[PDB]
Design a protein around this nucleic acid. Sequence first.
DNA 1: ATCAATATCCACCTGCAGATTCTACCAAAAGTGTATTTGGAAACTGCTCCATCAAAAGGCATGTTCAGCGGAATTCCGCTGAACATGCCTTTTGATGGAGCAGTTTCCAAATACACTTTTGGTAGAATCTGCAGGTGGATATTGAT
DNA 2: ATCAATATCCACCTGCAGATTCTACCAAAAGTGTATTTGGAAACTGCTCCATCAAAAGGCATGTTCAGCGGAATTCCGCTGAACATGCCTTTTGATGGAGCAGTTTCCAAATACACTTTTGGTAGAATCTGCAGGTGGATATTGAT
Lengths: 79, 83, 106, 109, 92, 95, 99, 98
Amino acid sequence: DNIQGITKPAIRRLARRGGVKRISGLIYEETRGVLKVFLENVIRDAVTYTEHAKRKTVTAMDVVYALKRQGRTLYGFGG
Amino acid sequence: KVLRDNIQGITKPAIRRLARRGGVKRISGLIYEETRGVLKVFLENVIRDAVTYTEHAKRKTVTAMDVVYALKRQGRTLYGFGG
Amino acid sequence: KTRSSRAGLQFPVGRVHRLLRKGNYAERVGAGAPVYLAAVLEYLTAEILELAGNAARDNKKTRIIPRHLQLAVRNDEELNKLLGRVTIAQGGVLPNIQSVLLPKKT
Amino acid sequence: RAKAKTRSSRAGLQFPVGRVHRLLRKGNYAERVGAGAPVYLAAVLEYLTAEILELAGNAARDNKKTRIIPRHLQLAVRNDEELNKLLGRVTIAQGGVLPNIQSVLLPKK
Amino acid sequence: KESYAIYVYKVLKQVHPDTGISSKAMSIMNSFVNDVFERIAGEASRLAHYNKRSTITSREIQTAVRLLLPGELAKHAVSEGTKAVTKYTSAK
Amino acid sequence: KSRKESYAIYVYKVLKQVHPDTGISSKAMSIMNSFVNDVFERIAGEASRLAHYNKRSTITSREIQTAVRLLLPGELAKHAVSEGTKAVTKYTSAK
Amino acid sequence: KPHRYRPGTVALREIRRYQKSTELLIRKLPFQRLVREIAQDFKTDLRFQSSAVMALQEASEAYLVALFEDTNLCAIHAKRVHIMPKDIQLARRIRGERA
Amino acid sequence: PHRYRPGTVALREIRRYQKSTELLIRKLPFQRLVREIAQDFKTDLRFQSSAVMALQEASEAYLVALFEDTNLCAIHAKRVHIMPKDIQLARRIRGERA
DNA sequence: ATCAATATCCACCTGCAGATTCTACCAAAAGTGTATTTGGAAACTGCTCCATCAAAAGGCATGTTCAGCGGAATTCCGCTGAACATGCCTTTTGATGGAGCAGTTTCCAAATACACTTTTGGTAGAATCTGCAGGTGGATATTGAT
DNA sequence: ATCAATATCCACCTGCAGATTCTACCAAAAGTGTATTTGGAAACTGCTCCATCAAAAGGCATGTTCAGCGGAATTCCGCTGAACATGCCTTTTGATGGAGCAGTTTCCAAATACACTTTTGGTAGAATCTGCAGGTGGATATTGAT
């Protein structure tokens, strides 16, 4: 599938910025699953603000507002 | 009457009981002092806000509502009781 | 006729419309807003009371107490989630011991 | 002069008091908004803004750069206990993280 | 002081005709309704402002309900809301 | 095309008082804008709740002050409070 | 001939017992003096509604119980059954009470 | 016939990635994922590019911080290799689980 | 595995604190009915900027080799906790002075409500400027083999 | 300790994507002045409920002894991650129609604002009713010793 687009070397790069030194082999599929749950929760809310405004295009603001109610405020695209 | 050292009123047996409710089976001897310290910080932050609401309303009495608003501010909403 | 009867509801549409206005949520409040909101509130309290009444029954009691409300909430995935940051006074917790802590083997 | 001194100049501020008042009103925060509120609020916003830029500016100097970028806002915020607390649940885009490796992970030596 | 008590009591009788409720449990039920009301209203409030709307209608309330409640509760809450408004709307 | 208000020019003004020779990139200005708006909404929200709790229709500078003490960490609240008191004083004591 | 429960049998007996009830587990007056002491150090001359004190106690006990569950999970992760201060610290760091 | 020991390379990688701020997942793959997931909620959607970006910044910042807590859990168990149970613990204690 | 010691489950029983049942007053809601005001759905439309495609760019998949992690087995020290004796201090049922919360009426400093005028921050198109990101060279620290 | 292969640094260089500068247009603000209104402070005070002292007694904290046994320390070694160099398949970059995101105009269904009429949820206090806490005893496990 597409989730495999998020590759081991990229997952490994994230881990490194997180200060991780050694990584187990099963971490990669574990990460993908968490990333997917994260995006689903946020995108769901973003899409809900999109539909509410009657648009067909998801806006930065829709994402920003969604991240905010998930308690994950993001600065830089407005917030 | 001066109030001092009341944190020791949270006894070892009371802390053990709370850990039982929390599903804990074995407790190291150092847990008691660590827990008192944790409770103290927790009470400090809530009372601090509860007292800030009391003063803002110009009252001398801390109400259950003051505490309930202070708990909600800190994301620890509480039901029934004022709270 | 009350707006609650016109809507076929038990919760007070009039009160909810008023609470909407005094809470300063917007300059204006449409007439449907309070009907919808009152319906939703009535629905959630029906859901929790159905579940709490059942818990009271399993504990051989006729009167619901805080503990039955807590049992009904923590035992329900969605209600547990909606109330994930809520503390129900005198509710205690759900009986639950981690596997590794039980004695013997096999 | 040109008789018409803006509220900000009266309060001695760079931030816009008229705008803040307007924003408090159209935000449905209350039925009314006293005259002193936007002044007080603008001053608080200006202060906090000065506070972060002061530290972000130093963060830039330390890297031999004259232009503050996101990276410099992140270093300034996460290296200050209080700003870090205030922005504890905020993500600054393109800010990265603080250089930090767990002691137990460094070479055996 | 107003409370949702008599209304919580009516719904209780509909789902469990022979069960009562202690005053403390009733007080918890009153905190619950007020809490849900405020959360739904807050979401609706922000929803309107983000869309430069000065009015909160059943439409913002519905979106607020979808944003705030977990899957299955959202679906049924929305049905009950829709149904109450459709009925209310045909009554006059 | 409609107007898009931002705090960018006032942020730039403040930047020059604090660091006259320093510049700021566009992406950084966007971060500061989000920052001002976020603090504004947090403070206004708490002041709002405060007035509602005390059954008051007006948000005064008094509510902004308590909101600030509730929201800002110790020392930051200390300075922010004096900065606000100072501007209101300077405002009142003037024509 | 004597008789003695083994370390662990009593613990489990106690966990089941306390997870079953809902009464507060900290003595009442001691907790009230503690709240009066901390409050006093913030502002003198304060009175408390008795329900404000009960409210703080219900919240503190709920907070501590939930904190021990997490602490318990951290000790178990380290293959232990004894919770130690470092388990409580790991739990609070992850919770962001100081991460 | 030269070879770097495991850990020496890792450590220099940590140094390197904690110094930079660039995104670490590639854009197109990430974009496809975002679109695939959204399609399940509503069909035929378009995305402002700034929206996908906001999403990538929030996702990466979310994962990096989760890896920090995961590391603290591995270390708590006296290990240097992070494992799935470390991530799970961190999420559970975080409330994304319990 | 049969025993003995104990804790737990559990249905029956009853004094009683907390609960649902009122009679009666009603200030505050909530509902009914014009009159006036307007927010925002709806239709039409120009300019963005988003999805798509092709050529140029560079990061990832893959298999061998092996350092070294961390779980398994073993050991034993010293902490934790069960059991138990003793006695304090919390809990409980009461009562009382009076602080201080909260209800009510009075009344002006301050906020709202237009209406008219001046200024200003935001947008658009053009021109000009510059901080620093990558790139090169050469020094030298770091790491791994011996 | 002694090289040998790299990685890391630093001082310098400069092309350009992004930042600074000057001009010109204008709806949207923000400031100003008049007239009308009102939220909530102040002064008086009813009355709730908070602080506090009293006294009796047993629930429960404290302190000790002593043994069960968890968990850190240590040795052993299986096998999993990680380094590394090989080959190209995917991502990245920049050029292009057209879908909608927005800006603008219209006008009516729907929301204020206002004057009454009427219904109801609160509550004050009486009382009466009733679920279940809590003490009791005995059938049923669940443990620990052997």
